[PDB]
Tab-separated table of C-alpha atoms in Angstrom:
chain	number	residue	atom	x	y	z
A	1	UNK	CA	30.102	-0.083	14.825
A	2	UNK	CA	28.068	-3.056	13.494
A	3	UNK	CA	27.055	-6.098	15.577
A	4	UNK	CA	25.783	-9.499	14.550
A	5	UNK	CA	22.534	-10.816	15.225
A	6	UNK	CA	22.121	-14.514	16.250
A	7	UNK	CA	20.095	-16.619	13.920
A	8	UNK	CA	18.817	-20.326	13.658
A	9	UNK	CA	20.462	-22.180	10.707
A	10	UNK	CA	22.199	-25.279	10.252
A	11	UNK	CA	25.001	-23.389	8.513
A	12	UNK	CA	25.071	-20.027	9.849
A	13	UNK	CA	25.475	-18.673	13.524
A	14	UNK	CA	25.110	-14.887	13.165
A	15	UNK	CA	24.547	-12.106	10.542
A	16	UNK	CA	25.517	-8.326	10.828
A	17	UNK	CA	25.159	-5.583	8.437
A	18	UNK	CA	26.850	-2.054	8.260
A	19	UNK	CA	24.566	0.210	6.338
A	20	UNK	CA	27.197	2.926	6.100
A	21	UNK	CA	29.829	0.703	4.454
A	22	UNK	CA	27.391	-1.613	2.731
A	23	UNK	CA	28.983	-4.439	4.520
A	24	UNK	CA	27.507	-7.838	5.374
A	25	UNK	CA	29.252	-10.084	8.008
A	26	UNK	CA	28.185	-13.900	8.284
A	27	UNK	CA	29.693	-15.952	10.881
A	28	UNK	CA	29.353	-19.780	9.748
A	29	UNK	CA	29.118	-22.787	11.986
A	30	UNK	CA	32.196	-24.604	10.954
A	31	UNK	CA	33.779	-22.188	8.422
A	32	UNK	CA	34.492	-18.968	10.564
A	33	UNK	CA	33.535	-15.426	9.825
A	34	UNK	CA	33.376	-13.498	6.355
A	35	UNK	CA	32.628	-9.963	5.352
A	36	UNK	CA	30.813	-9.372	2.091
A	37	UNK	CA	31.295	-5.938	0.469
A	38	UNK	CA	28.851	-3.911	-1.486
A	39	UNK	CA	25.693	-5.495	-0.310
A	40	UNK	CA	22.702	-3.424	-0.649
A	41	UNK	CA	20.460	-2.820	2.455
A	42	UNK	CA	17.323	-4.647	0.830
A	43	UNK	CA	19.488	-7.806	0.254
A	44	UNK	CA	20.147	-7.889	4.157
A	45	UNK	CA	16.391	-7.378	4.990
A	46	UNK	CA	15.536	-10.047	2.677
A	47	UNK	CA	18.117	-12.373	4.133
A	48	UNK	CA	17.107	-11.685	7.619
A	49	UNK	CA	13.332	-12.645	6.369
A	50	UNK	CA	14.223	-15.740	4.466
A	51	UNK	CA	12.790	-19.269	5.558
A	52	UNK	CA	16.156	-20.684	5.186
A	53	UNK	CA	19.347	-18.622	5.745
A	54	UNK	CA	21.292	-21.266	3.994
A	55	UNK	CA	19.150	-21.178	0.888
A	56	UNK	CA	19.216	-17.453	0.748
A	57	UNK	CA	22.856	-17.390	1.281
A	58	UNK	CA	23.547	-19.995	-1.459
A	59	UNK	CA	21.195	-18.313	-3.928
A	60	UNK	CA	21.790	-14.652	-3.584
A	61	UNK	CA	25.124	-13.801	-1.634
A	62	UNK	CA	27.524	-16.630	-2.120
A	63	UNK	CA	29.839	-15.647	-5.061
A	64	UNK	CA	27.856	-12.579	-5.925
A	65	UNK	CA	29.728	-10.144	-3.595
A	66	UNK	CA	33.365	-9.999	-2.974
A	67	UNK	CA	34.236	-11.502	0.279
A	68	UNK	CA	37.211	-11.678	2.776
A	69	UNK	CA	37.566	-13.932	5.878
A	70	UNK	CA	38.228	-12.120	9.182
A	71	UNK	CA	40.127	-13.726	12.166
């Protein structure tokens, strides 16, 4: 299965990616954990390399892939 990696961010606590299902999992500080569906592996790599995880989330992920909250 896929496991999230901790990251340093004012908004995001950890990020995981499942290359098989093309699924991205983001755990937010205040707002819980979401899965984003149909995310290409290159997106995940760029996410992990971004200077600002928040900026990258806002510009590339948010509202651009179907998401669901898990919990």
